[PDB]
Design an enzyme around this catalytic site. Structure first.
Site, PDB file in Angstrom:
ATOM      1  N   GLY B  44      -1.304  -4.158 -15.058  1.00  0.00           N
ATOM      2  CA  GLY B  44      -1.647  -3.139 -14.060  1.00  0.00           C
ATOM      3  C   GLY B  44      -0.608  -2.978 -12.962  1.00  0.00           C
ATOM      4  CG  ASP B  99     -12.372  -2.483 -10.119  1.00  0.00           C
ATOM      5  OD1 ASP B  99     -12.615  -3.609 -10.582  1.00  0.00           O
ATOM      6  OD2 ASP B  99     -11.646  -1.640 -10.698  1.00  0.00           O
ATOM      7  N   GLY B 101     -13.500  -7.395  -7.762  1.00  0.00           N
ATOM      8  CA  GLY B 101     -12.872  -8.607  -7.180  1.00  0.00           C
ATOM      9  C   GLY B 101     -12.985  -9.884  -8.040  1.00  0.00           C
ATOM     10  CG  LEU B 104      -7.156  -9.718  -6.618  1.00  0.00           C
ATOM     11  CD1 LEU B 104      -5.996  -9.748  -7.601  1.00  0.00           C
ATOM     12  CD2 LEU B 104      -7.339  -8.319  -6.055  1.00  0.00           C
ATOM     13  NE  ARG B 161      -1.226   0.220 -19.927  1.00  0.00           N
ATOM     14  CZ  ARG B 161      -2.145  -0.675 -19.549  1.00  0.00           C
ATOM     15  NH1 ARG B 161      -2.168  -1.132 -18.309  1.00  0.00           N
ATOM     16  NH2 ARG B 161      -3.023  -1.134 -20.427  1.00  0.00           N
TER      17      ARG B 161
HETATM   18 MG    MG Z   1     -10.512  -7.220  -9.749  1.00  0.00          MG
END
Ligand code: MG
Ligand code: MG
Lengths: 166, 172
Positions: B44, B99, B101, B104, B161
């Site tokens: 990403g 979004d 989390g 992350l 992308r």
């Molecule tokens: Mg996330």
């Protein structure tokens, strides 16, 4: 104990990557098959981000980490390239040793087509005869850094190609 | 699924924003005097990392990790770890979107155990409405609703992308 000089400025790189972009676009726009640009990490991340934005053809973007030693897949692709046009994106071609092997490896998976695009080619340094269909700049055998290329884990973030000076 | 893409965050607005994230990041870290590293999560973050790192006026390493992308209750698994050590370093995790989390949050815990000097997240896009797990996020390009977004590293079915702008996907 060194300095960096500018070797290729940021403006020239950008101009050159727009031209590569048009060219990759003309080669591939009439295929209709799925396309994927395949970066070799870590060095190719910046060139790929700039080049993929100049390629006016729907494509997947995927990455690969390859190692007197064998070339080992330290991280393979996330997607299948069988029956796909595949363009390998590399910061610099030198010996040609690694890219030649990476080419062979992906060839076993039977893409429709397979090709390489490199930003830098050091053709004085070539040890193996590797087909390279798109080149940014053929350069002398300088110690280059920046634009993803490092010196002992430094200067990957420089927005121009520098040569290191001892 | 039959669809179209409209522009939502044009290329030039991403650039203006990334330039301001870089001044902010430079400011917080210029006087540190430790090694710094920017850790992008693949796939990403690749294009955001490219642009961001060029706007950071501090000597840093650039490294990447792939965490399990299973998608949107399984474990977060390192498919590909860092190539370089982070103990004693300033580490900025670079993501395209937060979004839920979940990922992350788990990536932060794992790198935390390596005892960086500091640990911090820079995302381009934040959907606060989608948060399922609290994680601190120091640097945010844009706060957006739960729009169906693509481009600048965000795929729709491994497509778009490479778009140099954030687009909205319209289901016909
Ligand atoms: Mg996330
Ligand atoms: Mg090589």
């Amino acid at each position: 104990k060194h300095t960096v000089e500018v070797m290729i400025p940021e403006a020239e790189i950008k101009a050159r990557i727009a031209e590569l972009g048009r060219q990759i676009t003309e080669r591939y726009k009439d295929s209709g098959s799925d396309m994927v640009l395949v970066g070799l990490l870590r060095g190719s991340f910046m060139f790929m981000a700039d080049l993929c934005r100049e390629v006016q053809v729907s494509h997947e973007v995927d990455f690969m980490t390859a190692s007197t030693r064998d070339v080992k897949i330290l991280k393979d692709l996330d997607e299948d390239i069988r029956g796909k046009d595949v363009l390998i994106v590399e910061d610099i071609i030198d010996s040609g040793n690694t890219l030649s092997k990476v080419r062979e490896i992906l060839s076993l998976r039977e893409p429709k087509s397979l090709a390489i695009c490199t930003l830098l080619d050091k053709p004085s340094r070539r040890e193996v005869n590797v087909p390279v269909e798109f080149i940014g700049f053929s350069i002398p055998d300088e110690f280059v850094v920046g634009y993803g290329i490092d010196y002992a884990q430094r200067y990957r973030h420089l927005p121009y190609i520098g040569k290191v000076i001892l």
